[PDB]
Each structure stands twice: as structure tokens, then as C-alpha cells.
Amino acid sequence: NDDKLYRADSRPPDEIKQSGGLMPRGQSEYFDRGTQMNINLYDHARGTQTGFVRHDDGYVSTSISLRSAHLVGQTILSGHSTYYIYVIATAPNMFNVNDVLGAYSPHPDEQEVSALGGIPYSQIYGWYRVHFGVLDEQLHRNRGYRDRYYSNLDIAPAADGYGLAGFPPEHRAWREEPWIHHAPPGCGNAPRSSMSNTCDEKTQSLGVKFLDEYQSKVKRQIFSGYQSDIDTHNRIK
Amino acid sequence: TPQNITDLCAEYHNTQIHTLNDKIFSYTESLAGKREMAIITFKNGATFQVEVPGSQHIDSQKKAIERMKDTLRIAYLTEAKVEKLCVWNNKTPHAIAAISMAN
Amino acid sequence: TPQNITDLCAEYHNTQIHTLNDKIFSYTESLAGKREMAIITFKNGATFQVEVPGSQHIDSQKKAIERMKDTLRIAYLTEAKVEKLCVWNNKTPHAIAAISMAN
Amino acid sequence: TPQNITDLCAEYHNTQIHTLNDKIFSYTESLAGKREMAIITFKNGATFQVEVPGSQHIDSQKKAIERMKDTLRIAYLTEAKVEKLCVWNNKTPHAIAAISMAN
Amino acid sequence: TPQNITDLCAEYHNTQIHTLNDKIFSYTESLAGKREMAIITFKNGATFQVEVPGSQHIDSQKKAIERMKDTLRIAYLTEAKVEKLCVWNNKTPHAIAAISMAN
Amino acid sequence: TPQNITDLCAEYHNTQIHTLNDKIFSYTESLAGKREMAIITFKNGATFQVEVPGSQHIDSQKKAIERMKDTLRIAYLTEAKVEKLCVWNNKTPHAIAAISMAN
Ligand SMILES: OC[C@H]1O[C@@H](O)[C@H](O)[C@@H](O)[C@H]1O
Ligand SMILES: OC[C@H]1O[C@@H](O)[C@H](O)[C@@H](O)[C@H]1O
Ligand SMILES: OC[C@H]1O[C@@H](O)[C@H](O)[C@@H](O)[C@H]1O
Ligand SMILES: OC[C@H]1O[C@@H](O)[C@H](O)[C@@H](O)[C@H]1O
Ligand SMILES: OC[C@H]1O[C@@H](O)[C@H](O)[C@@H](O)[C@H]1O
Ligand SMILES: OC[C@H]1O[C@@H](O)[C@H](O)[C@@H](O)[C@H]1O
Ligand code: NA
Ligand code: NA
Numbered sequence: 106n107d108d109k110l111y112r113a114d115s116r117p118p119d120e121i122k123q124s125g126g127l128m129p130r131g132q133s134e135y136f137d138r139g140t141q142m143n144i145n146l147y148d149h150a151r152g153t154q155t156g157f158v159r160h161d162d163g164y165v166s167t168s169i170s171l172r173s174a175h176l177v178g179q180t181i182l183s184g185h186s187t188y189y190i191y192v193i194a195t196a197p198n199m200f201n202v203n204d205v206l207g208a209y210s211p212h213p214d215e216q217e218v219s220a221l222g223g224i225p226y227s228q229i230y231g232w233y234r235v236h237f238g239v240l241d242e243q244l245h246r247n248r249g250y251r252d253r254y255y256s257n258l259d260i261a262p263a264a265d266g267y268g269l270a271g272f273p274p275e276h277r278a279w280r281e282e283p284w285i286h287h288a289p290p291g292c293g294n295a296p297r298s299s300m301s302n303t304c305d306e307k308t309q310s311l312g313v314k315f316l317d318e319y320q321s322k323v324k325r326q327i328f329s330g331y332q333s334d335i336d337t338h339n340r341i342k
Numbered sequence: 343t344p345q346n347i348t349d350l351c352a353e354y355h356n357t358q359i360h361t362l363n364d365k366i367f368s369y370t371e372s373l374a375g376k377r378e379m380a381i382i383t384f385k386n387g388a389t390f391q392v393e394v395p396g397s398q399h400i401d402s403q404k405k406a407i408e409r410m411k412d413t414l415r416i417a418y419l420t421e422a423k424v425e426k427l428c429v430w431n432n433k434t435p436h437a438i439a440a441i442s443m444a445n
Numbered sequence: 446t447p448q449n450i451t452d453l454c455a456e457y458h459n460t461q462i463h464t465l466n467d468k469i470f471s472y473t474e475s476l477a478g479k480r481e482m483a484i485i486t487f488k489n490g491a492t493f494q495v496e497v498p499g500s501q502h503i504d505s506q507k508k509a510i511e512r513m514k515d516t517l518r519i520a521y522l523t524e525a526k527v528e529k530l531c532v533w534n535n536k537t538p539h540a541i542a543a544i545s546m547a548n
Numbered sequence: 549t550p551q552n553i554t555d556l557c558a559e560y561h562n563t564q565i566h567t568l569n570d571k572i573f574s575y576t577e578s579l580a581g582k583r584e585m586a587i588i589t590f591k592n593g594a595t596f597q598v599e600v601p602g603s604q605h606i607d608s609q610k611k612a613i614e615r616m617k618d619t620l621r622i623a624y625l626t627e628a629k630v631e632k633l634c635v636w637n638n639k640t641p642h643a644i645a646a647i648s649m650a651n
Numbered sequence: 652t653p654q655n656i657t658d659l660c661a662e663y664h665n666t667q668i669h670t671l672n673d674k675i676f677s678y679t680e681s682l683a684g685k686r687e688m689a690i691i692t693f694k695n696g697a698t699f700q701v702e703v704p705g706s707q708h709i710d711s712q713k714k715a716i717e718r719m720k721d722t723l724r725i726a727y728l729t730e731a732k733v734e735k736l737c738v739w740n741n742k743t744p745h746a747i748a749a750i751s752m753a754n
Numbered sequence: 755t756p757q758n759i760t761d762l763c764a765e766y767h768n769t770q771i772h773t774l775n776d777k778i779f780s781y782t783e784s785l786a787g788k789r790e791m792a793i794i795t796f797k798n799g800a801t802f803q804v805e806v807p808g809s810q811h812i813d814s815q816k817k818a819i820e821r822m823k824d825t826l827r828i829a830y831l832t833e834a835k836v837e838k839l840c841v842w843n844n845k846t847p848h849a850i851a852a853i854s855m856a857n
Contacts, residue, residue, distance in 0.1 A: 321571065329622070337611065340614055
């Protein structure tokens with residue numbers, strides 16, 4: 106559906122465009138491989154929100170309303186005389202943190218939805234300028250956005266997120282439902298969970314695979330658009 | 343002069359409208375001799391061709407056949423929703439005469 | 446030599462500007478004989494054609510007609526905002542002479 | 549008239565289907581004289597060519613060869629999953645006759 | 652043989668370089684007779700044309716004019732940063748001879 | 755028949771391979787008379803041309819030159835990683851004969 110998410114951010118639109126979207130900490134451009142960064146949802150969600158809205162450990166966090174994100178912006182981005190609230194389409198690169206982390210979601214209060222790999226430019230509907238706390242209610246539409254594509258998508262089911270949850274191996278989550286049935290190798294009661302680092306590795310590789318497959322979908326939509334000008338008749342006469 | 347695909351389709355003998363309101367499920371393309379054509383399917387199983395250029399086409403159609411094959415390829419790849427096809431139904435599979443995309 | 450679409454439009458009899466400032470709602474394409482054309486609509490219901498090549502076109506227009514059909518297809522698929530159309534208004538639907546797109 | 553690539557492939561001597569269900573790993577393109585061709589590989593090591601136009605091609609194939617090289621380039625860049633290739637297996641590497649892509 | 656647009660521009664009388672380092676703000680395209688041309692603008696107000704094919708063009712330029720109009724359209728739509736234009740400055744608006752794009 | 759760009763390149767005396775494994779940094783395109791050509795650079799400073807069509811090209815190369823210019827434009831815009839170029843090294847800048855792309 107055409108549900109939107111929202112994120113206060115200090116990085117302006119020109120930088121977003123150069124980076125090809127809203128990037129996790131450490132990532133320069135969206136179409137970088139996942140091996141660049143640590144991809145771990147548990148780690149992402151535990152991060153302190155001091156200076157920036159959570160974007161560590163391979164995910165970028167969003168709020169579920171304009172009001173939520175503005176409020177968060179006034180808490181966190183107190184200090185920037187201008188920041189922006191990015192309006193963001195729902196798509197299956199996006200996980201509901203509280204559903205996936207469940208009873209172990211460290212900030213259940215904040216009802217955060219987080220994007221694995223960051224948010225590609227095409228998935229950004231637009232942005233509001235915030236000058237000295239004052240939202241300007243004139244939205245700037247992003248010409249890179251594709252309404253027909255993203256309106257057809259929703260966030261990921263929690264079931265798609267359990268295996269990527271990213272608890273350390275010794276954590277009791279891997280030994281309880283629902284996660285036990287989605288546990289990576291080496292996590293939970295798989296032999297040598299405490300000694301092996303097999304858990305944290307499979308977590309990483311399952312994360313990188315997910316981003317790979319998702320990057321393929323983005324490329325296919327955007328870069329097909331870019332090639333829809335081709336006329337074969339010109340060249341064959 | 344027709345203002346939509348339905349009006350256009352009604353001008354021709356042996357044509358029909360299919361309403362699909364869905365993206366193309368599969369795209370096939372051939373350069374084999376005498377079979378230089380395209381085939382598309384929808385998930386409901388409906389199957390359509392762009393005909394091999396032949397003596398049933400006038401010269402002005404030749405460029406448009408090539409255009410249509412372009413359109414279908416890129417429609418497939420962008421997962422564009424096809425609204426309606428106008429097809430000649432005296433061919434198997436049905437031969438595309440026009441396409442409309444919305445939504 | 447015109448520096449914008451409005452100045453261009455004013456050089457021709459039987460033309461007018463439509464200001465749309467919107468993406469194309471629907472794109473239609475035909476390879477049927479004598480109807481090798483394209484039709485676009487906007488959500489407000491406005492409807493436009495690229496004319497079938499004919500004797501009202503000089504030779505240099507033929508390539509530009511093909512280009513325009515390309516432009517509209519890719520405009521539709523990228524959801525590009527169209528600013529203005531210059532159209533001949535002695536045709537139904539109105540026939541595109543020029544398009545402008547702006548940030 | 550075939551309704552899918554498998555039926556199409558079966559109409560020709562010296563052809564076979566490869567089922568890949570994978571994106572193209574590499575795309576190569578040449579304008580060197582007598583080697584105006586394209587080569588693609590998949591990660592499993594399979595390698596395919598679009599043949600240099602030659603006397604084994606009829607005139608109607610010439611445009612389709614050009615189209616196929618377009619299709620492979622775009623497929624490569626969009627990371628589209630290729631379902632099946634129909635190839636002539638009396639060439640090394642195997643020569644593409646048809647391609648199919650499916651959701 | 653020039654290795655960049657600046658060196659290329661210097662080979663021609665009545666040319667100059669504009670450095671823009673910005674995306675195209677507007678793209679206009681016309682198929683009206685005797686005005687089969689393109690116009691682009693930048694946000695700073697600078698305005699450029701691709702000339703109507705004419706007797707000042709040699710035959711080898713004809714294909715390149717068509718290519719240039721393609722390039723500008725796709726540059727506009729992808730919001731690609733244009734680095735420099737080489738233009739003839741004995742035309743109004745200035746006529747594009749070459750374009751360069753860089754990150 | 756070569757199965758990769760390296761084998762292809764080795765069939766010609768005046769050619770060599772460059773290994774770049776990088777996206778194109780800049781793309782330049784010209785319609786100026788006698789310089790209807792394209793130039794690309796990489797961030798390491800390497801510079802390559804697609805030659806102006808000339809009498810050193812056979813007829814089958816003409817279409818491939820046009821294809822190559824297409825490929826480079828779209829490669830630039832999609833930031834596709836170029837693996838290797840095969841180039842003629844009796845020109846300055848070196849003239850592209852083939853390109854290979856893999857991630
Ligand atoms: O000329 C053959 C075709 O080549 C494409 O790359 C271009 O974008 C089209 O507009 C058409 O010109
Ligand atoms: O123009 C193409 C059409 O030509 C008709 O004469 C024929 O009956 C149709 O089946 C279709 O082939
Ligand atoms: O150049 C195309 C135009 O030609 C005119 O003569 C005609 O009155 C217009 O309706 C349009 O067809
Ligand atoms: O149409 C082209 C085909 O022609 C066949 O005769 C040949 O066996 C194939 O290798 C392929 O070249
Ligand atoms: O070839 C294109 C150029 O041709 C020249 O003769 C003319 O002075 C320029 O203004 C431009 O038209
Ligand atoms: O086929 C193209 C090549 O032709 C050769 O004769 C020449 O040495 C090269 O510079 C290149 O132009
Ligand atoms: Na959505
Ligand atoms: Na060599």
C-alpha cells in the first residue's frame with residue numbers, strides 16, 4: 106500500500122542524491138556491497154541516539170508518522186538550525202523492530218521501522234525542511250521516486266526478519282519461539298555456540314545476501330526505466 | 343480518431359480487448375529464422391505474441407512492430423501494470439495490436 | 446529561434462499550450478495498420494495523440510514523431526512530471542507538437 | 549506458432565534449452581572487424597555468444613540479432629533473472645537463438 | 652584527436668565552453684515542421700539548443716545530432732550532473748556541439 | 755571463436771587489454787563535424803575514445819560503433835563496473851574495440 110514512513114536527518118537532499126539514498130553509518134553509496142558494514146538488527150537497535158537518529162550496524166531507522174519523526178528530530182537534531190524529514194515509501198527492505206526483536210526490543214516505546222542496507226533514493230517520496238524546529242508544510246517531491254512501484258509494496262513480515270535478528274549466540278532468544286525455528290547455525294543450542302563465532306558470521310552473511318537480492322530489485326526497476334527510451338528501429342534503418 | 347484502446351479495437355475485424363490489470367509474468371524473445379518474434383504471458387496463463395513481420399503487415403506497421411517489442415520488454419522489466427490489450431483473435435496465440443498501461 | 450515551448454507554439458497556426466504539471470496517467474500504443482500512433486491521458490482526463498505519419502508531415506518530422514513516442518513511453522515509466530504540451534487543436538484528440546519537462 | 553521458448557527451440561535442428569534461473573554474471577561486447585559480437589557468462593561458468601551476422605543468417609534475422617544484443621545488455625545491467633536460453637549447440641560457445649525471463 | 656571536451660571545443664571557430672556542474676532543469680522537444688529541435692535550460696537560466704538539421708551540417712553529423720537529443724533526454728530524466736557544454740556562440744540560443752558528464 | 759575479451763583481443767596485432775575494474779568517471783559526446791565521437795575517462799586518469807567512423811572500418815563495424823557509444827552512455831549512468839577494455843594502441847587516445855563488464 107501507499108503507507109509512508111518518516112525520518113529526521115541532518116544530511117541534506119543533495120548529499121542523499123550523491124549517496125544514492127539514506128545511508129547507514131559507514132556506507133558511502135547505496136549500491137556498495139553489504140560486506141562494507143556490520144549488518145545486525147539487535148546491534149542497530151541498541152545504539153544510542155546521541156546526535157543522530159539511529160543508523161548504525163547496517164540499518165536506518167524510521168518513524169511511523171510525520172509527527173513522530175518531527176518530535177524525535179527536536180530531541181535528537183536539536184543543534185542543527187536546519188534538518189530534513191524524509192518521507193519514505195514502505196517496502197520489504199523494512200522491518201518492524203519490535204516485532205522482530207519481540208520482548209527483547211530495547212526501545213519498545215519508539216515503534217521504529219528500520220531499513221536493511223539503508224533507503225535507496227527511489228524509495229524516498231520527498232522531504233520537509235525544518236528551520237529552527239519549524240516544519241515547513243510545503244513538501245518537496247523527489248523526482249527519483251516511483252509511486253506505482255512502491256505503492257505496490259509493504260514492509261517485510263516479521264517472519265522474514267527473525268533469522269536476521271542478530272542476537273549473540275548465547276542469548277536465550279535463539280532458544281525460544283519464534284526465533285528458535287529461524288536460528289542461524291552456531292546460534293542457540295547448536296554445538297559450540299559460546300566458543301565458535303559461527304553465529305555472528307552467518308548473521309552477517311544472511312544479511313549481506315538479503316541486501317544483494319534487494320539491490321537487484323531496485324536496479325531492475327530504476328535501471329529499466331532508464332533504458333525505456335531505446336528504439337531498435339532507428340539502428341536497424 | 344480513437345481516444346482510447348477500446349475505441350481503436352472496435353475499428354478492426356477480428357480483434358478483441360483483454361483486460362488484464364496486471365504486470366507481465368514472462369517475456370520471451372527469438373532471433374531464430376522465420377520466428378523473429380516476442381511472446382508474453384500473464385500469471386493467469388494468458389499468452390500473447392508480437393507477430394513475425396509478414397505480408398499481412400503494411401510498411402507503416404514494420405516500425406511499430408519493432409516499437410511494440412521494445413515496449414513489452416521494458417514493461418516486463420519495470421513490472422508496469424498492463425491495463426488492456428487489443429489483439430487479433432484469428433491467430434494463436436492472439437496477436438497484439440495495441441497495449442494500454444495505467445495504474 | 447524559440448527559447449521555450451510557449452514561443453515555439455506561437456509560431457504555428459492552430460496550436461495551443463496545455464499546462465499539466467503532472468505525470469502521465471496512461472500510455473497507449475498501436476501497431477494496427479493506418480493507426481500506428483500513441484495516446485496519453487492525464488488524471489484530469491486530458492487526452493493527447495501522436496499523429497499517424499501522413500502527408501501533413503514533412504520528411505524531417507518523421508524521425509521526430511518516432512522520437513516523441515519514445516519520449517512519452519519513457520516519461521510514463523519514470524513518472525516524469527510534464528510541464529506543458531504544445532498541441533495542434535484542429536485534431537481530436539489534440540495532436541502533440543512539443544513537450545516540456547521541468548524540475 | 550510456439551507459445552513458449554521450449555516449443556520454439558524444438559522447431560530447430562542443433563538447438564537445446566539451458567535453464568539458468570540466474571542473472572548474467574558478465575557481458576562482453578566487441579566492434580573489432582569480423583568479431584562484431586556479444587558474449588555473456590553465468591556464475592556457474594556457462595558461456596554464450598550472439599553470433600557475428602553471417603551467411604547462415606537470413607535477412608529477417610539481422611534486426612533480431614541487434615535486438616538480442618540490446619536485450620542482453622539491459623538484462624545484465626538490471627540484474628534481471630534469465631529463465632531459459634535456447635541455443636545452437638553446433639557452435640562454441642553456444643549461440644543464442646532465444647531468451648526467456650520470468651517473475 | 653582531442654582527449655577532452657575543452658580540447659575538442661578549441662578546434663572549432665565560434666565555439667566556447669560553459670561549465671555547469673549541475674543537472675538539467677528543463678528539457679523541451681518539438682516535432683513541429685522546420686523546428687524539429689531540442690532545448691535545455693539550467694536553473695541559473697542558461698539556455699541551449701540542439702539545432703534543426705540543416706545545410707550547415709555534414710552527413711556524418713546527422714546521426715550525432717539524433718544521439719545528442721537522446722543523451723540530453725536521458726540526462727534530464729536521470730538527473731545526471733552535466734559538467735561542460737561546448738557550444739557554437741554564433742547562434743541564439745547557443746547550439747550544443749558537445750557534452751561532458753562527470754561525477 | 756573467442757570465449758572472452760582477452761582471447762578476442764589477442765587475435766589482433768595493434769590491440770591491448772586494459773584492466774580497470776572500475777566505473778566510468780566521465781562520459782563525453784560530440785556532434786561537431788569530423789569529430790562525431792565519444793570519450794570516456796576513469797578516475798585513475800585513463801582515457802579512451804570511440805573512433806569517428808572512417809575508411810579503416812568495414813561496414814559491419816559501423817553499427818557496432820553506434821552500439822558501443824550506447825553501451826558506454828548507459829554504463830556511465832548506471833555506474834556499471836567495467837572489467838576490461840580491448841583497445842587499438844596505434845591511436846591517441848586508445849580506441850575501444852571491445853568492453854567487458856562484470857561485478
Ligand atoms: O538509435 C537507436 C536507439 O538507441 C537508443 O540508445 C536511444 O536511446 C534511442 O533513442 C534510439 O536512438
Ligand atoms: O496487420 C496484422 C493483422 O493483419 C490482418 O490481416 C490479420 O487478419 C491479423 O491476424 C493480423 O495479422
Ligand atoms: O505537422 C502536423 C500538423 O500539420 C498541420 O498541417 C495540421 O493542420 C495539424 O493538425 C498537424 O497535423
Ligand atoms: O540462423 C543461424 C543459425 O544457422 C544454423 O544453420 C547454424 O547451425 C547455427 O549455428 C546458427 O548459426
Ligand atoms: O555544424 C554546426 C555548425 O555549423 C557551422 O557552420 C555554424 O557556424 C555553427 O553555428 C553550427 O551551425
Ligand atoms: O578497425 C579499427 C581499427 O582499424 C585499424 O586499421 C587501425 O589501426 C586502428 O586504429 C583502428 O582504427
Ligand atoms: Na509501500
Ligand atoms: Na593483441
